[PDB]
Amino acid sequence: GDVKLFNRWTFEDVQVSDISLNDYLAVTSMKHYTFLPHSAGRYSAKRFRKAQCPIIERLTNSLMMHGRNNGKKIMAVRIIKHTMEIIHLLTDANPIQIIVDAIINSGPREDATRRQAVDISPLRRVNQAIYLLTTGARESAFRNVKTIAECLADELINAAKGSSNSYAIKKKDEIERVAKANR
Amino acid sequence: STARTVKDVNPHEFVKAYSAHLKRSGKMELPEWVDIVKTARFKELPPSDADWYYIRAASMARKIYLRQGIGIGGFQKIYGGRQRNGSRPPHFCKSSGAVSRNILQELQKMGIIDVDPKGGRLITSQGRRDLDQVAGTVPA
Amino acid sequence: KVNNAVLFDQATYDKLLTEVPKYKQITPSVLSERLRINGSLARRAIKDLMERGLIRMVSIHSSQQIFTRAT
Amino acid sequence: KFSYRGVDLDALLDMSTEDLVQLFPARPRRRFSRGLKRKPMALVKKLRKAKSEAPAGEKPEQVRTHLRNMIIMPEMIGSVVGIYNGKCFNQVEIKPEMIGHYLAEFSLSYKPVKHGRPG
Amino acid sequence: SLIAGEEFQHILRVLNTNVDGKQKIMFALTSIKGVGRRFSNIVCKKADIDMNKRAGELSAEEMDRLMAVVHNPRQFKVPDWFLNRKKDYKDGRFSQVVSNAVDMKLRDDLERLKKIRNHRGLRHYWGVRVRGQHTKTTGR
Amino acid sequence: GHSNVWNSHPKNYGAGSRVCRVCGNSHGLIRKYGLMCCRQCFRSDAKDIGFIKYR
Amino acid sequence: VQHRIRITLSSKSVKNLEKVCSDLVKGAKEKQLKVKGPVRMPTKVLNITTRKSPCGEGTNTWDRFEMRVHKRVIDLVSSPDVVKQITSITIEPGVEVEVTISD
RNA sequence: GCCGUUUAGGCGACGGAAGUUUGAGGCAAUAACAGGUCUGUGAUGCCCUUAGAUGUUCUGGGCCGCACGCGCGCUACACUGAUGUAUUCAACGAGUAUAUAGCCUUGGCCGACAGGCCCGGGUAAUCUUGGGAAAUUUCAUCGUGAUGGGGAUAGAUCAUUGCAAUUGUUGGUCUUCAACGAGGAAUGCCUAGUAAGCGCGAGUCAUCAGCUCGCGUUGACUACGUCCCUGCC
Ligand SMILES: [K+]
Ligand SMILES: [K+]
Ligand SMILES: [K+]
Ligand SMILES: [Mg+2]
Ligand SMILES: [Mg+2]
Ligand SMILES: [Mg+2]
Ligand SMILES: [Mg+2]
Ligand SMILES: [Mg+2]
Ligand SMILES: [Mg+2]
Ligand SMILES: [Mg+2]
Ligand SMILES: [Mg+2]
Ligand SMILES: [Mg+2]
Ligand SMILES: [Mg+2]
Ligand SMILES: [Mg+2]
Ligand SMILES: [Zn+2]
């Protein structure tokens, strides 16, 4: 327990349930434990190197949108910290487990290309989960008194439970449905 | 604890403590144009803090403590920032020179900062002592 | 169209002093949405409840102020 | 009763030139402070002849000039100047409300556009 | 925080203008034409009016002092470079034009140029731009 | 007096006062470093003047 | 000897300037004069960027011309006589030698 | 190590500063196009004009004109923000005829600003400049309201450049406070220190940068394929 996120949250007790989505969320291995969701890492030179990037950092990078927020990663890390504290307040559990549960219960597993229904790979699954989570939080925050950190916390908490009150889960459902209608 | 100099304390707390120190000392005479002026022309409102004069005095006192030879133009550049030009791109702008000069002269009329022959302003031994003895009171 | 109030009425002050300390998370946004009050009033009410000692503070920051209940 | 900063027209006529600069706006003030060139004074020296040699209480004979960048003085409230606009001299009887303005501001150098075919 | 007051007025009829009582007094005074944020700030400071209050929180006397300052910024020592009518054409007096007098001064200043056939007055009369901007592609 | 109305406009500044030192054209003039050549003339004599293209 | 001599060398080429500098510092070290140098100043990069087209047609393509000025400073302690006796060898073209006597 | 005809090569891995011929440029074949340029050239054939000139110069005006259409852009529509404090990190480059002084300006004084005055430094790793850049950071205010978002338009006024500022050169001060709440059909650029954000320098230049050519700061998402479209072979 030497490395803790923000020196306030433990990594050892994080259980990544899905065996499929296990090598594409970098939380369990000790090599993927970091103090800060900020690395300035070169996780884009190769095709499958962003999978070995810490998952909190992958969540943080999707907050640097839109263009008005591009490159502002310290503010994104601040949002992540203030979101992880609200998560611990409203769930009394480890915020990293809530985050991995939300990313697991948000990635669509089947999609319709071309309209044949195709199955999503684990990497695109986690990418879509993160994209939907941060997109829903950002759209909740836009033109709203609620802070982006509070909207992110609410979205993550509702996605961890599996409730259809989270924009990501509603959208996952639509996506997979259109791949059931067009099977 | 004590034995902490200025380069040991958080600047945000040191400036707040030294502005209170200066306001308590009662050796600062404020101009008539304290509640009117803006710190710079790119500013669109006067400072919202009533004790902004003492806060800026503490800020410049600390800056003269850490560096020697700062002139009025240098302090105009230090407290200058971004100007928004309406429909035109923003650029850098400089601060007001009257405010900097008046506060520095008020700080010369306390023996905190003198003026060096080499140009600008230096910190006096009494000013160094004052800032260092206030830095020890700053809670860590 | 928000109709957030800027000054409490005595009934809303009573509800702020009784029901709000029972909230788990207490931030200006939640109080503004629930009590139908302005964000300035929310921040100032949070400061007053921190003065009467009816809440704790989990994290304070310029953008986000996070408070919780002591009980 | 034309005033120009609370003064009266007669007092303005009699007022010293160094004060009259201080009643004028900043652009005329800088113009006078940098010193007027020989063509500007010469035009007023011709306008005062036109005003004096005027037969009687009729308008002074038109004095044409190319001087568009000239500050209108209170001395010239009786003058009838024709300013060249590039193509012709437009006659203007200078009025006291015109004090401080340029002569160019009273001789249009283009034609007001009235649009026709969309083309 | 501060709970309320039985005297709290939601709409205050001020200088033939309606001021929202649910607004901070400084930005509430910017409802009257001729008063901007900076002149309202100066008026609030010179009238000794709390800037952390709301317009409805103030009493009758406080707005009376605000109007003493607004109708005579000079007696209250507001410098002359701070006025929207500096060195009036006819009068030559510095003054702060507020309310419908701003529109009146606009109309009179335009009529002055529309009688002397000045270029800018004719531009105003033609409904075109008066500050020397290109009119081919913008302003449509 | 024709000599006081011939070339009587001031040439203290303006584009119509500086000319190419190789051709006398007043357009596209590079005043940097005191070159005083036009763009086209500098592009032609640059090798002689000593400007080498590396990037 | 007595006085302090600063020889400034400038050039547009590195090899000629460096071999001239080597000749100077070799001559200085043969006559047993102490030499501080060569000291290489930051290289000046004179840059001109202009549209290659002699007109205004085509892709607006830009050629970037550069002139690189290399400055070398040699600091001896000696008398003027030995200095002009040293800086009298064949200085290669393009190299601007400049001798200045200090205290 | 595996794949590959076990070749030529590819993928992965250790090590390594670097493994994507390391990144980015410069240069860049044959053959063309009635491509642009006679308004760069004291490069030019021919034709026209040549003293009441299509020469030259001076004055003034125009190139800016405004029912409208199109292209490149800048500023936004906000709280992942605006405003006011506090705070502290670049790089590329540029700079004088010293005449009282010319360019870059330090320091002192006056001035709310704008600016002015007075001593000086620097032809420059020496002085401007350790380039005291912003975004960012911190605290506070605002509180979802076209609102403290936005700043178009407009009035008054003061300064500076200039021989001259009106058809506002520009910079200030107070005031005025429009559309715009994310943009239809379309369509552009982009695969890593990249896009995007942020500012700086240079060229133009007496003054004027919403433009270009460079610079650094902050710094992602997505893909590691295909011929579906577009084009080329
Ligand atoms: K040609
Ligand atoms: K020809
Ligand atoms: K040319
Ligand atoms: Mg929000
Ligand atoms: Mg100065
Ligand atoms: Mg911007
Ligand atoms: Mg052709
Ligand atoms: Mg044009
Ligand atoms: Mg700020
Ligand atoms: Mg508004
Ligand atoms: Mg604004
Ligand atoms: Mg121009
Ligand atoms: Mg420029
Ligand atoms: Mg295309
Ligand atoms: Zn040429």
Tab-separated table of N, CA and C in Angstrom, chain E residues 48-49 69 71 87 126:
chain	number	residue	atom	x	y	z
E	48	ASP	N	-20.369	55.317	0.803
E	48	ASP	CA	-20.193	54.453	1.969
E	48	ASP	C	-21.322	53.426	2.056
E	49	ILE	N	-21.449	52.650	0.984
E	49	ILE	CA	-22.474	51.623	0.857
E	49	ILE	C	-21.777	50.276	0.764
E	69	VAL	N	-24.511	60.990	-4.661
E	69	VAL	CA	-23.286	60.756	-5.418
E	69	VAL	C	-23.530	60.681	-6.924
E	71	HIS	N	-25.893	62.110	-8.756
E	71	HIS	CA	-26.306	63.396	-9.374
E	71	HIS	C	-25.258	64.497	-9.193
E	87	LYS	N	-16.264	68.149	-20.674
E	87	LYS	CA	-16.079	69.366	-21.461
E	87	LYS	C	-17.176	69.503	-22.515
E	126	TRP	N	-27.665	58.760	-43.021
E	126	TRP	CA	-27.834	57.772	-44.077
E	126	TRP	C	-27.989	56.358	-43.541
